[PDB]
């Protein structure tokens, strides 16, 4: 096949993407070994769905797992009656998700399970795939002529030819695996044919962070989780927390081989030590550096000019309420809280008004990084840790280091009951989730 | 003094730059040796004059040379009754140049002799200096916060402690020297204090070309000879022909030492060979690579963002005439022609109308590069060699390789008699010059 593996793409046809997926245990070859994973569509990652605004998506999910499951359409501003975090599809049963892609939307999204208490083992075992919303902006020459690739960043650990089970420490930290894969492949080679690459990046890991840096090159950020920036932003590295997405342009500077690496990053994961008295929790410290892929540049590369502008960010109405959400941890219990409470699906925590704008101040009073995710209602990050964000774009996950406050502008869109939660999915399963009702 | 030598600056005071310079043989230390050069203001290069639009310049030139001389205000769109190419200042005499700096003007200009038949030895001996027109655009943060430096690129050859005399081959080729200097210094070190540098570049050499490249870095072109571009243009290298100027931003990428080099370039200079029968002219081939300066980057450099826009280029009226000027050579005679004729100060070659726009097609039917210069009337280069120019900016010198046609939009500004000529100044002295009269 092609030097660079990417998930098979399913495209809408005549404005309709009608597809039946099965969630199923699937024997496959992965990273040179045979394993049985849980997959959508028989592959890991699942198929990439590629749609345009105003397309109809009709996705029938058949549950062939031994436990109930459902789908979260991560990042899509659609109705929580479709993107329903409380729905359960029993083993052997099917459910059809049907929605229209919003008109004012573009970027890289993804789908994965969201059945409270079961997300972390299901996602870790292989249940996820990407969804791309194509834009009329992709026809501008500076993007159309770039070489486009999707990079699904997801790690894995195998034991006896199956995903390794969760340990107690995994529930506290979030589980990371030793196989650090791109599109399910171990350190693939990307032999570039053009001098400008457009890379869609997805962190679909349970808990692993990717401090991305390409040897000898900057990255040009052009989209965040849920939409384009207003203009490209040059960065020397890009941190992608669990659930985040980004699109970058890479402008290859000379012939040669360049490593794309996940540089060392300390997210506050903890271990246990005994040195006499004891035993106490001790920081694991920074992650070991990983090579994600080998990028081979073409001969005499002459990159395109960057686009001057991308998409103007909407002017938002003045906000009508300020919320404060405080994240805390009980690490030894592996319990995680928002404003002192664990998730209860019967309890509404916040009540807001559709088509108003809110300011959410999310404060991490824990010691671990927590990537905060809100369903249904994309937000504008104003500042994190007191530092203003250097761009305007729609996001739906924001990473908070220990002690940091994020200030978020949140336009409330579709009415209904939805959730917000940590996207270290073990922490969500262990209670770090709350309920928003929009009326 | 400072690690990086630059000419002393004279600034206008209260809207007036009133200065008396003397053109004088001057003993000095240069490149570690003692030599007697011909200088303005006792220095090599002469002092940098720094003015703003609408300033008055009152420059009294005292001629203390043993031959007549004058000044050309290279690149300034002022009256040819001030910038007078036919004026002669006899030895011992003085002349006052007085003019107002045009309102719509910015960039790096320069001054040097323009007495036909004597330019090449006078310029080679050290008579030149820079003139900077400051702009309100220099207050935008992306320029104001850059570290600014002027680089006067000029080579020299010394013999018996004086500039080496011209040989017959020098009159044919244009004279180049073995001492390849920046601001009169041999391979200086620039220890950058900021991560973004703004470098004003001036080729004040008689004939040497500078194929500029900074190790490991692109250059961001922001101004041509006579004004800003509309937006920065990224280039991997920049060819600066005799008389050309440019301004570039340099965005230092990492700590370290980076060479600024004049890479090998073949301008078509000729030598003589005898291999049996013979003797015939033979190409000299490309220049040897030269190191111009050592650039030391600061610790943890974080360059500013580039400016998004610089100056919009004026919309010009539709042209009313097309001219064709053909350059040819008689190399063994060291004679050079425009449309088959050598310069005659009594003969008007072109007659144009003030405030109209002309298209000039300048065609190099020789084998050497010829950098074509027009006094008084800056032009827009549309294309050279059939390739469209990638930016809009005012220029006053355009380099033509063998066979190439340059297409130039030339708005005629001040009335009066002026000249156009090759800026390999030996070729001008040997006849490659003509007369334009604007009425
Ligand atoms: Cu998600
Ligand atoms: Cu968390
Ligand atoms: Cu969720
Ligand atoms: Cu000149
Ligand atoms: Cu010439
Ligand atoms: Cu001239
Ligand atoms: Na299947
Ligand atoms: Na003097």
From TrEMBL, chains A, B:
Chain ranges of the Plastocyanin-like domain: 30-136, 172-263, 324-438
Keyword Translocase found: no
Enzyme kind, highest EC tier: oxidoreductase
Gene3D superfamilies registered for this protein in UniProt: Cupredoxins - blue copper proteins
Entry-linked SUPFAM superfamilies: Cupredoxins
InterPro entries in alphabetical order: Cu-oxidase-like_N, Cu-oxidase_2nd, Cu-oxidase_C, Cu-oxidase_fam, Cu_oxidase_Cu_BS, Cupredoxin
Protein biosynthesis listed as a keyword: no
EC numbers, comma separated: 1.10.3.2
Keywords for this protein: Metal-binding, Oxidoreductase
Chain positions recorded as Cu(2+) 1 binding sites: 74, 112, 423
UniProt name for this protein: Copper oxidase
């Amino acid at each position: 096949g092609p030097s660079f593996p990417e998930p098979k793409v399913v495209r809408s046809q005549g404005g309709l993407l009608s597809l039946k997926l099965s969630a199923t245990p699937t024997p496959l070859a992965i990273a040179g070994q045979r394993a049985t994973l849980l997959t959508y569509g028989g592959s890991f990652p699942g198929p990439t769905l590629r749609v345009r605004p105003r397309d109809t998506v009709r996705l029938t999910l058949e549950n062939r797992l031994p436990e109930p499951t459902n789908l979260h359409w991560h990042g899509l501003p659609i109705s929580p009656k479709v993107d329903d975090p409380f729905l359960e599809i029993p083993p052997g049963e099917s459910w059809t998700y049907e929605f229209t892609v919003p008109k004012e939307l573009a970027g890289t999204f993804w789908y994965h399970p969201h059945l409270h208490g079961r997300v972390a083992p299901q996602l870790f075992a292989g249940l996820l795939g990407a969804l791309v919303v194509e834009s009329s902006l992709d026809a501008i020459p500076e993007l159309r002529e770039a070489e486009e690739h999707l990079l699904v960043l997801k790690d894995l650990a195998l034991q006896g030819g199956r995903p390794a089970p969760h340990t107690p420490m995994d529930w506290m930290n979030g589980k990371e695996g030793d196989l650090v894969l791109v599109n399910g492949a171990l350190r693939p080679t990307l032999v570039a044919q053009k001098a400008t690459l457009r890379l869609r990046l997805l962190n679909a890991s349970n808990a692993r962070y990717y401090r991305l840096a390409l040897q000898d090159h900057p990255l040009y950020l052009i989209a965040a989780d849920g939409g384009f920036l207003e203009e490209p932003l040059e960065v020397s590295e890009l941190l992608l927390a669990p659930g985040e997405r980004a699109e970058v342009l890479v402008r290859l500077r000379k012939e040669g081989r360049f490593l794309l690496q996940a540089l060392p990053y300390d997210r506050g994961a903890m271990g246990m030590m005994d040195m006499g008295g004891m035993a106490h929790a001790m920081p694991q410290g920074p992650s070991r550096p990983e090579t994600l892929l080998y990028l081979i540049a073409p001969k005499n590369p002459k990159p395109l000019p960057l686009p001057k502008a991308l998409s103007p960010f909407p002017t938002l109405p003045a906000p009508v309420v300020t919320r404060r959400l405080v994240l805390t941890e009980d690490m030894m219990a592996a319990r995680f809280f928002i404003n002192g409470q664990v998730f209860d699906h019967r309890r509404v925590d916040l009540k807001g008004q559709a088509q108003t704008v809110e300011v959410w101040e999310v404060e991490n009073q824990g010691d671990m990084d927590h990537p905060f995710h809100l369903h249904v209602h994309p937000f504008q990050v104003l500042s994190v840790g007191g530092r203003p964000f250097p761009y305007r774009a729609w996001k739906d996950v924001v990473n908070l280091k220990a002690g940091e406050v994020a200030r978020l502008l949140v336009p409330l869109r579709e009415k209904g009951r939805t959730v917000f939660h940590c996207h270290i999915v073990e922490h969500e399963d262990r209670g770090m989730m709350g309920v928003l009702e929009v009326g």
